JSON list of C-alpha atoms and ligand atoms in Angstrom, two decimals:
[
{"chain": "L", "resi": 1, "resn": "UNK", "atom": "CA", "xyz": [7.11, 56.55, -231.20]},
{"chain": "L", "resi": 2, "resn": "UNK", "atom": "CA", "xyz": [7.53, 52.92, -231.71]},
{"chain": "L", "resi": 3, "resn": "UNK", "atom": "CA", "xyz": [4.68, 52.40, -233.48]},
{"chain": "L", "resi": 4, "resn": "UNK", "atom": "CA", "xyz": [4.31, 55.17, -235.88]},
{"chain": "L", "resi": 5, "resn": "UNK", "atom": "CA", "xyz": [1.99, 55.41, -238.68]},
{"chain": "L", "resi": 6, "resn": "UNK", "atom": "CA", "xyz": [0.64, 51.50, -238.26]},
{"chain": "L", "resi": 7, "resn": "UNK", "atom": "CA", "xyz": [-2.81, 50.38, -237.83]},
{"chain": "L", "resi": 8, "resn": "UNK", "atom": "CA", "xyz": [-3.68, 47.69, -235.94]},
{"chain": "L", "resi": 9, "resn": "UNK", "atom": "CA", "xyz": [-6.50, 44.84, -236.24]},
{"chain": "L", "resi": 10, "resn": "UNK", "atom": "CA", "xyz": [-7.52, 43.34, -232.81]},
{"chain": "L", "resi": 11, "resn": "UNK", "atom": "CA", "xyz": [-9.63, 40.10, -233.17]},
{"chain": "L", "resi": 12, "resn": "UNK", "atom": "CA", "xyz": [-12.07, 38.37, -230.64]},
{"chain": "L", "resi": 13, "resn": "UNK", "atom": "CA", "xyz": [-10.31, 40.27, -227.73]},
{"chain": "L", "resi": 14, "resn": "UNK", "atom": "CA", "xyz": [-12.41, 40.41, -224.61]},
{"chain": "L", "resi": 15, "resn": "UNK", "atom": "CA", "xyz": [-13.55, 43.71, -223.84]},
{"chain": "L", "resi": 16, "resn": "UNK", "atom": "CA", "xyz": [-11.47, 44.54, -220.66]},
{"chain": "L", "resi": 17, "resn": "UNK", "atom": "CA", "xyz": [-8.41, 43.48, -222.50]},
{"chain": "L", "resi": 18, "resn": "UNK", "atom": "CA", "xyz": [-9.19, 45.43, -225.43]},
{"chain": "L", "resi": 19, "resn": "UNK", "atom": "CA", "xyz": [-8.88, 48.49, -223.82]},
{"chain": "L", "resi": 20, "resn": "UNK", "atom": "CA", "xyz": [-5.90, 47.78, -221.95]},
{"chain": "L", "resi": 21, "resn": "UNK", "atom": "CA", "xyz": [-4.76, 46.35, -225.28]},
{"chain": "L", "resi": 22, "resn": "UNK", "atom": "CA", "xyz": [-5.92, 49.76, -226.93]},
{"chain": "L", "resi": 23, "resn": "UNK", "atom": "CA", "xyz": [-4.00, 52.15, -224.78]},
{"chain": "L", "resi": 24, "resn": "UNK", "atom": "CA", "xyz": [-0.85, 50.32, -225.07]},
{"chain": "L", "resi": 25, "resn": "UNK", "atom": "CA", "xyz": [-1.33, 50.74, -228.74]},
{"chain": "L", "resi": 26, "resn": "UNK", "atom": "CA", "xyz": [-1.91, 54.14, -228.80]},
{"chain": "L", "resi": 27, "resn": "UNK", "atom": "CA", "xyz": [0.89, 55.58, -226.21]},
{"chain": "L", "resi": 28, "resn": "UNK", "atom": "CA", "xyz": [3.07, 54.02, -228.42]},
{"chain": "L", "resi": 29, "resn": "UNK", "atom": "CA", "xyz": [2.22, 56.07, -232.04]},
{"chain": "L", "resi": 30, "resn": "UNK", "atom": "CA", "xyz": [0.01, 53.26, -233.25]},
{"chain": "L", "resi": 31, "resn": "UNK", "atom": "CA", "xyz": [-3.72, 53.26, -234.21]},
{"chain": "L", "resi": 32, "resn": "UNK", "atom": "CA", "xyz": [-6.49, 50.93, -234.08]},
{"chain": "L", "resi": 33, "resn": "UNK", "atom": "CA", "xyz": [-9.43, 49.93, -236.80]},
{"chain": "L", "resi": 34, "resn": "UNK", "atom": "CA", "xyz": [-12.44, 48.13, -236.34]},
{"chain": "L", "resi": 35, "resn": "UNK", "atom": "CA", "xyz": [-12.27, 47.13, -240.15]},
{"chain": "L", "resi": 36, "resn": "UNK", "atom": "CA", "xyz": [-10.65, 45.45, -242.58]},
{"chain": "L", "resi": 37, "resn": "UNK", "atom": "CA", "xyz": [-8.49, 47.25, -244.95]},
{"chain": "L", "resi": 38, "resn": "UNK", "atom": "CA", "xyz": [-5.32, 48.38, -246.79]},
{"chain": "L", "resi": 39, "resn": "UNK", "atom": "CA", "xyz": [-4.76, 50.41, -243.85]},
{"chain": "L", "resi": 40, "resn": "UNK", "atom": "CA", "xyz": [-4.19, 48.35, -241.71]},
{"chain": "L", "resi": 41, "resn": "UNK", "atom": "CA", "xyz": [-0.62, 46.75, -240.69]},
{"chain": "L", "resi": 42, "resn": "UNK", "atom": "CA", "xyz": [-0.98, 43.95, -238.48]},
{"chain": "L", "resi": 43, "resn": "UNK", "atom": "CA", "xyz": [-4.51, 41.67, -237.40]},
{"chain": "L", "resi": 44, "resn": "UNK", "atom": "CA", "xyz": [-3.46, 40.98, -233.58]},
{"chain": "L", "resi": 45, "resn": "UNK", "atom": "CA", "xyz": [-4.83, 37.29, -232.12]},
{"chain": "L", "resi": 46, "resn": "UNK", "atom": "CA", "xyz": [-5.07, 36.24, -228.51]},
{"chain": "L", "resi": 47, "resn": "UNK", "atom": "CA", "xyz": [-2.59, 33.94, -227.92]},
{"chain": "L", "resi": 48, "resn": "UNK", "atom": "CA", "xyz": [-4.63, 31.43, -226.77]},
{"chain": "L", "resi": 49, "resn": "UNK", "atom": "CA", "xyz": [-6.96, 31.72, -229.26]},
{"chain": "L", "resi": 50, "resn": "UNK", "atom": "CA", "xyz": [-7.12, 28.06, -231.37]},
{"chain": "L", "resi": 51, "resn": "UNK", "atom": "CA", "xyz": [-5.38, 28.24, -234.61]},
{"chain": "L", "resi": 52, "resn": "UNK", "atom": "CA", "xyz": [-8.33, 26.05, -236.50]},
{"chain": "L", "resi": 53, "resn": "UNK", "atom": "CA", "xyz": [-10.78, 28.62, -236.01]},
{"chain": "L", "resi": 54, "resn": "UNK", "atom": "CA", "xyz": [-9.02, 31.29, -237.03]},
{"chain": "L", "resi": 55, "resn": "UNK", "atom": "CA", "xyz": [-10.66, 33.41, -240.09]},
{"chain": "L", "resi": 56, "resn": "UNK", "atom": "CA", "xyz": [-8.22, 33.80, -243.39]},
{"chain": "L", "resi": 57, "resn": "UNK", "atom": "CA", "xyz": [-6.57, 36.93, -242.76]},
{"chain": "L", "resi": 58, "resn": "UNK", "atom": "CA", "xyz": [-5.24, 39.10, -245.93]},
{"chain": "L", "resi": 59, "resn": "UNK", "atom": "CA", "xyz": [-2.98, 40.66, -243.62]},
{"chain": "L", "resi": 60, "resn": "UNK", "atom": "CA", "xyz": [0.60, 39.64, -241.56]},
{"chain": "L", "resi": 61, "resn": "UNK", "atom": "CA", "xyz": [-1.34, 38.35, -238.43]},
{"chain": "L", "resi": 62, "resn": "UNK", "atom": "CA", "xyz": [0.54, 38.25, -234.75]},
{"chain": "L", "resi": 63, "resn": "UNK", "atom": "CA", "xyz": [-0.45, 37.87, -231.44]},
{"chain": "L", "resi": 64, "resn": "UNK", "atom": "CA", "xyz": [-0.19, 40.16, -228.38]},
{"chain": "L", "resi": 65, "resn": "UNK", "atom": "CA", "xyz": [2.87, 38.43, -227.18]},
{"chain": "L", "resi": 66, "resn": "UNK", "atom": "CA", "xyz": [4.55, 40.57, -230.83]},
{"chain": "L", "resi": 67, "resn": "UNK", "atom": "CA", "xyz": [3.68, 43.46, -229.41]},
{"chain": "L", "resi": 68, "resn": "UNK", "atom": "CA", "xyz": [5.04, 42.85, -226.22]},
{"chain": "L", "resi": 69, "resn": "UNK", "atom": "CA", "xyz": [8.56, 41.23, -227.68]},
{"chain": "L", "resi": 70, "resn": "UNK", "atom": "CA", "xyz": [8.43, 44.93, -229.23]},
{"chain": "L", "resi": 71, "resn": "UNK", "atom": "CA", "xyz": [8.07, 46.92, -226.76]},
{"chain": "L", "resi": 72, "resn": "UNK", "atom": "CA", "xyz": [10.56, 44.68, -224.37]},
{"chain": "L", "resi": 73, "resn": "UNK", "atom": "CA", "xyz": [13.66, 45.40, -226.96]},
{"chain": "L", "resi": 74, "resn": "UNK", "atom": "CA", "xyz": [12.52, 48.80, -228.53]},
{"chain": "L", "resi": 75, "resn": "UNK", "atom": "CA", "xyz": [12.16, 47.59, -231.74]},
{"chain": "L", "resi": 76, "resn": "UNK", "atom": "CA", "xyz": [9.82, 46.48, -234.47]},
{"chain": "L", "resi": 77, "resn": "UNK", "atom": "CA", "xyz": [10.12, 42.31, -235.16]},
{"chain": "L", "resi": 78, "resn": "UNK", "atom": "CA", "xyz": [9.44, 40.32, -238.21]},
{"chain": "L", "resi": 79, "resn": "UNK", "atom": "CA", "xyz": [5.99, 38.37, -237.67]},
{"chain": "L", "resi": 80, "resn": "UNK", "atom": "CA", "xyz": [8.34, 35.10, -238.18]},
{"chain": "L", "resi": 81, "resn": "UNK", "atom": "CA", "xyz": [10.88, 35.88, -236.15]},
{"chain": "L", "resi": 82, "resn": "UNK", "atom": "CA", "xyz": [9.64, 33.77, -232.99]},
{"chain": "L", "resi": 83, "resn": "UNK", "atom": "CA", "xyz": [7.45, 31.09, -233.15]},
{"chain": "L", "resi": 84, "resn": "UNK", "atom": "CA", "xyz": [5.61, 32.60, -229.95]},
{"chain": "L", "resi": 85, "resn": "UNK", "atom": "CA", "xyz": [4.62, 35.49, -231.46]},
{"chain": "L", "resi": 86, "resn": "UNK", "atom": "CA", "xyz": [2.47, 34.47, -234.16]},
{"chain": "L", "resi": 87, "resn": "UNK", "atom": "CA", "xyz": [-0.75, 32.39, -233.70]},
{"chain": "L", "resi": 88, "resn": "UNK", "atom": "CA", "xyz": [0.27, 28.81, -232.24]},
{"chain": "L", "resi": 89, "resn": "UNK", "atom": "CA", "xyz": [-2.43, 27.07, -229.69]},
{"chain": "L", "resi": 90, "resn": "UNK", "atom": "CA", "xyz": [-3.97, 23.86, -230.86]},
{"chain": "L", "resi": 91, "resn": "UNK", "atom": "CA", "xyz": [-6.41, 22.36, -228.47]},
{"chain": "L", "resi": 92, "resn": "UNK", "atom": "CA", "xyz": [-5.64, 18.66, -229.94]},
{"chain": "L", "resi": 93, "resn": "UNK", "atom": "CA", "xyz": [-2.13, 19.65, -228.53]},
{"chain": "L", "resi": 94, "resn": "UNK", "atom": "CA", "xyz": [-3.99, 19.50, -224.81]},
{"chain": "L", "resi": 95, "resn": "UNK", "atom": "CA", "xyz": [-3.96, 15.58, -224.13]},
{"chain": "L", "resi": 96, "resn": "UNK", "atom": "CA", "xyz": [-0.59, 15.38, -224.92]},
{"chain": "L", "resi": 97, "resn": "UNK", "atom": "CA", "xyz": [1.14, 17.76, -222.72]},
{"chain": "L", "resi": 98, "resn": "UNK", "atom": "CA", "xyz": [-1.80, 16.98, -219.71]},
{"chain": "L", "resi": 99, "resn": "UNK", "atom": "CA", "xyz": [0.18, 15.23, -216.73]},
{"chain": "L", "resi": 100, "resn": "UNK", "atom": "CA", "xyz": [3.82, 16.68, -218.07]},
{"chain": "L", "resi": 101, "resn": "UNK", "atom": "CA", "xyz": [6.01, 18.07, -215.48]},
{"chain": "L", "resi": 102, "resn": "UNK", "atom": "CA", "xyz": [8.06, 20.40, -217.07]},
{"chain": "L", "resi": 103, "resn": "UNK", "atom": "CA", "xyz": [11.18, 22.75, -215.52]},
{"chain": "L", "resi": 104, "resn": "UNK", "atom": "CA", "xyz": [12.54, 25.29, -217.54]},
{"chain": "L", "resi": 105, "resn": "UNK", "atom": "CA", "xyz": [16.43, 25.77, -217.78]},
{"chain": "L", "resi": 106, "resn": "UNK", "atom": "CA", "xyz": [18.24, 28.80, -219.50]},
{"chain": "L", "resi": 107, "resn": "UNK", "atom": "CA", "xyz": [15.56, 30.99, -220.33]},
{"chain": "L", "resi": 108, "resn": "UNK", "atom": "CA", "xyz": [15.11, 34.97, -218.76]},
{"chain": "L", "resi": 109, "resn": "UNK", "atom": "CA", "xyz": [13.09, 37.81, -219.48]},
{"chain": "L", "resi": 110, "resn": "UNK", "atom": "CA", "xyz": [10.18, 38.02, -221.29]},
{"chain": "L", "resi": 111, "resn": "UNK", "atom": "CA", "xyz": [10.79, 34.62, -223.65]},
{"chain": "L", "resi": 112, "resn": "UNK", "atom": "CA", "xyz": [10.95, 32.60, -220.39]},
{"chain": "L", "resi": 113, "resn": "UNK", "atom": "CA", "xyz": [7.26, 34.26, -219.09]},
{"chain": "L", "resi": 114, "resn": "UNK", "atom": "CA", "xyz": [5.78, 33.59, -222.70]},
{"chain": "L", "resi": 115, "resn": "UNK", "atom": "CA", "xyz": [7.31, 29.92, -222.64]},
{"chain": "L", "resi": 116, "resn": "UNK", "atom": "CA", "xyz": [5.17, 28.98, -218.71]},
{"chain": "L", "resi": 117, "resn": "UNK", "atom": "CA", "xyz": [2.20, 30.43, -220.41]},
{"chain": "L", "resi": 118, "resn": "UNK", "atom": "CA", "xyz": [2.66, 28.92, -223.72]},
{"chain": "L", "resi": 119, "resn": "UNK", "atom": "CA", "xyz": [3.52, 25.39, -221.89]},
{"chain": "L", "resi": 120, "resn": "UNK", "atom": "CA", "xyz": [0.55, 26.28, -219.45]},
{"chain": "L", "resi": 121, "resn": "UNK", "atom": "CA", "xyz": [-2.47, 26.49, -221.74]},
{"chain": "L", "resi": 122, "resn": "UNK", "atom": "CA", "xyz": [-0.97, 23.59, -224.09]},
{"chain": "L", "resi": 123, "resn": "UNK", "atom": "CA", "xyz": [-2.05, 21.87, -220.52]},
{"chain": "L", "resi": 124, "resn": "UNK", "atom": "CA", "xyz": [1.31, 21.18, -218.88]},
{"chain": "L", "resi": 125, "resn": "UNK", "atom": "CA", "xyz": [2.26, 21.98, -215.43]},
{"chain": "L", "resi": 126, "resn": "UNK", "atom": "CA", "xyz": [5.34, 24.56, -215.79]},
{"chain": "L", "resi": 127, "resn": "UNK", "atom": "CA", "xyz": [7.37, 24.10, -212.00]},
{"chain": "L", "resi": 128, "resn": "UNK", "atom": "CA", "xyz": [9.21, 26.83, -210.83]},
{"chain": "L", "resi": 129, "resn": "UNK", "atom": "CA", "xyz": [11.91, 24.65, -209.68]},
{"chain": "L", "resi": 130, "resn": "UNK", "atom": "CA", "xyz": [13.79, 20.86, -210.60]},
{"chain": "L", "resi": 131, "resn": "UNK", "atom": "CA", "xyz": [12.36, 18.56, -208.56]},
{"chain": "L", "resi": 132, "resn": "UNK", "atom": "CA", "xyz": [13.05, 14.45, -208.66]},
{"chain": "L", "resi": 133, "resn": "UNK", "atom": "CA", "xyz": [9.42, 13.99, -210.40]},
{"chain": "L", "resi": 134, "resn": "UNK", "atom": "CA", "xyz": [9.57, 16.24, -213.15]},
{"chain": "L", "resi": 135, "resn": "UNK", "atom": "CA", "xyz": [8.91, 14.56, -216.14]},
{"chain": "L", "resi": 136, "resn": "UNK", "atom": "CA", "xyz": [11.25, 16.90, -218.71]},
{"chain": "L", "resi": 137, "resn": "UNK", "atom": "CA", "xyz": [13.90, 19.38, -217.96]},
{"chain": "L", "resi": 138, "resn": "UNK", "atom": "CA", "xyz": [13.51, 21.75, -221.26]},
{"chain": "L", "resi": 139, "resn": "UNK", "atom": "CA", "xyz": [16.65, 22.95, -222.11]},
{"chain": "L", "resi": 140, "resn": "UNK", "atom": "CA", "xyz": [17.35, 26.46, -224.16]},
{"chain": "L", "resi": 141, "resn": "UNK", "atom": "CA", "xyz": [20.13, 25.26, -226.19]},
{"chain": "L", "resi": 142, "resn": "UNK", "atom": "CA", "xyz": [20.18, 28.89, -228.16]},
{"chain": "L", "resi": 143, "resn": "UNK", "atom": "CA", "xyz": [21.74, 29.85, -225.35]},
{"chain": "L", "resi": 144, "resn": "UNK", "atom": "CA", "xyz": [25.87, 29.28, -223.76]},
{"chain": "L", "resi": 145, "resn": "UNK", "atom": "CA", "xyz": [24.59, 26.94, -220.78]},
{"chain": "L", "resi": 146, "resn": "UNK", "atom": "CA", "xyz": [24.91, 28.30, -217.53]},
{"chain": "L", "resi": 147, "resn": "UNK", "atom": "CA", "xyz": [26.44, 26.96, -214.65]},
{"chain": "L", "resi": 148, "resn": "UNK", "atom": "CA", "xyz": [23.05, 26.51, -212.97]},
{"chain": "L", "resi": 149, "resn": "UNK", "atom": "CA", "xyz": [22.11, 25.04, -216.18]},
{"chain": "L", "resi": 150, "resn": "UNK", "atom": "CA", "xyz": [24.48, 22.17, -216.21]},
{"chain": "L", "resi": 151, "resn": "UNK", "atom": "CA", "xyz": [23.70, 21.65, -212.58]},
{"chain": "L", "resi": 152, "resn": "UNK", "atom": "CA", "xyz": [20.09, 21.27, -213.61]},
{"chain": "L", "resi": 153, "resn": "UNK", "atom": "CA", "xyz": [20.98, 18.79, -216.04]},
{"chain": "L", "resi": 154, "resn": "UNK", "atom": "CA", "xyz": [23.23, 16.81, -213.90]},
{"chain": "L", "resi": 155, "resn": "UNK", "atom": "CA", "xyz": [20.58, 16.15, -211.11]},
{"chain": "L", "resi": 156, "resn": "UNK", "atom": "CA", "xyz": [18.00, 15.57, -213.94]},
{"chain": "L", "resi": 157, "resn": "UNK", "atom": "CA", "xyz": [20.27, 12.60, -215.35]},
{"chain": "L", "resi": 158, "resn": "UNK", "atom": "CA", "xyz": [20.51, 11.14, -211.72]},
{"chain": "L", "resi": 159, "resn": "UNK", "atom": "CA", "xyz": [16.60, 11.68, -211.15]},
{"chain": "L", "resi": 160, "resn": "UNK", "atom": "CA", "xyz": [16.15, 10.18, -214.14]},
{"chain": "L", "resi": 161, "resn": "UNK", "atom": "CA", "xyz": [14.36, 13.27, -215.41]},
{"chain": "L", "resi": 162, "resn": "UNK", "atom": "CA", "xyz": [14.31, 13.51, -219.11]},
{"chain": "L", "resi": 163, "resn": "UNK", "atom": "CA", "xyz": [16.65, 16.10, -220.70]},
{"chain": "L", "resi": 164, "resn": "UNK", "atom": "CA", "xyz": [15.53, 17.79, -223.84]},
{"chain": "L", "resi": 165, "resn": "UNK", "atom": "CA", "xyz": [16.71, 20.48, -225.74]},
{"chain": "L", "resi": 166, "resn": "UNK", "atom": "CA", "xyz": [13.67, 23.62, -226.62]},
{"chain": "L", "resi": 167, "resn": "UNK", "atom": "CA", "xyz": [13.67, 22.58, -230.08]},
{"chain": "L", "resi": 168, "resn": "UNK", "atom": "CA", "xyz": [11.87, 19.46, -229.71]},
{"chain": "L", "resi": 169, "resn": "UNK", "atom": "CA", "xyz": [8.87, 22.19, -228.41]},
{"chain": "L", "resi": 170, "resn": "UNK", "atom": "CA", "xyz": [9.57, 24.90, -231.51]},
{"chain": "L", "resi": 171, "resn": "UNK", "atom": "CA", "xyz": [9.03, 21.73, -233.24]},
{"chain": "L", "resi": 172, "resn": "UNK", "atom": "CA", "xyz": [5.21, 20.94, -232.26]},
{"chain": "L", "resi": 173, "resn": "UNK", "atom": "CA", "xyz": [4.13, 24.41, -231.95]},
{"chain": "L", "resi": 174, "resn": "UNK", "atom": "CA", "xyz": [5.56, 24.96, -235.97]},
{"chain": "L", "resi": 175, "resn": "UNK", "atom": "CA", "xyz": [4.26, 21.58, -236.71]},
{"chain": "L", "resi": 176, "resn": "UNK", "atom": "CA", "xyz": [0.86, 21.64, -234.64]},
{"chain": "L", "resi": 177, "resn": "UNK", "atom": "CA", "xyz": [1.76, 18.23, -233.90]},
{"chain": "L", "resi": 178, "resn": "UNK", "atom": "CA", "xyz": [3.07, 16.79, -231.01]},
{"chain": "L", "resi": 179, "resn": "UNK", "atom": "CA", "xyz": [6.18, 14.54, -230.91]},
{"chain": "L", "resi": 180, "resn": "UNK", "atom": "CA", "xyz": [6.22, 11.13, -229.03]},
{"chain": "L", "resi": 181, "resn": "UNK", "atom": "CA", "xyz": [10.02, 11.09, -229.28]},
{"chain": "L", "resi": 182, "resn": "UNK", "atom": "CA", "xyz": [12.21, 13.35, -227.52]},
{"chain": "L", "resi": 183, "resn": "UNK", "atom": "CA", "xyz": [15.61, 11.17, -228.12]},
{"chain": "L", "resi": 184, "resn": "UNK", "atom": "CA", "xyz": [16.53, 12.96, -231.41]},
{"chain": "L", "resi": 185, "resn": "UNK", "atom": "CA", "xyz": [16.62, 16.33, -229.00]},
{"chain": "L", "resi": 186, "resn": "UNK", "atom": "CA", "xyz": [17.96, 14.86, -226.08]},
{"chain": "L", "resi": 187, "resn": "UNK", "atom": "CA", "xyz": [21.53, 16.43, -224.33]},
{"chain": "L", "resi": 188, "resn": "UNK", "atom": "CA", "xyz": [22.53, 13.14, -222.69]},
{"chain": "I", "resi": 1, "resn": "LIG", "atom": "CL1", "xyz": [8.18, 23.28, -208.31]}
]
């Protein structure tokens, strides 16, 4: 099993998630504590649970989006290895992304669901497709761009849609603060 002799800490969950949450868990090898202690392997957050109330944690704390990276690729991350996956909502981050357009350009799988969500509850309106008013087409720029992607980008430099690459965002979730100027992180 994938998660084999670990023990894991779930914190605040609601209880309908919990035991969806719990059962996921446990058909993969992995076990659950209601306590605090050298057992245990990893304290899980909710995602959009806000950073600055978060207790201090002795332990290598994730949230459920790490256990679902894991289970997507079969294999057991680091807790740093995506900025997602750990702990990252900031309700000060709110005003700043309210009224944002954004269309996403590059991304598949499971990173681009996590990214809507992530952009979502940081209170930005993710659109499923470029449109002349979108306010930022958010480029993955890990990534060889796509043909579709450098269509994207040409119709967003007619539309006068702003072109930035992803790490201007990696940038205020790490950070916790937002960033007024995209230009450093712009294609052009
Ligand atoms: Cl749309």
């Amino acid at each position: 099993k994938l998660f084999k002799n670990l023990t894991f800490y779930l914190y605040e969950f609601p209880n309908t998630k919990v035991s969806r949450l719990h059962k996921c868990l446990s058909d993969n090898g992995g076990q659950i504590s209601e306590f605090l202690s050298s057992t245990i392997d990893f304290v899980v957050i909710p995602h959009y649970f806000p950073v600055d109330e978060l207790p201090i944690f002795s332990f290598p704390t994730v949230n459920e989006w790490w256990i679902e990276r894991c289970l997507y690729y079969k294999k057991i991350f680091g807790i740093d290895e995506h900025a997602l996956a750990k702990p990252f909502f900031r309700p000060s981050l709110v005003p700043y992304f309210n009224g944002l357009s954004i269309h996403l350009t590059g991304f598949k799988g499971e990173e681009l669901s996590h990214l809507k969500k992530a952009l979502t509850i940081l209170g930005a309106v993710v659109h499923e497709f470029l449109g002349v008013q979108r306010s930022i087409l958010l480029v993955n720029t890990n990534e060889p761009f796509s043909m579709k992607t450098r269509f994207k980008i040409q119709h967003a430099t007619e539309w006068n849609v702003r072109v930035v690459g992803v790490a201007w965002l990696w940038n205020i979730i790490q950070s916790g603060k937002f960033i007024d100027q995209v230009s450093p992180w712009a294609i052009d």
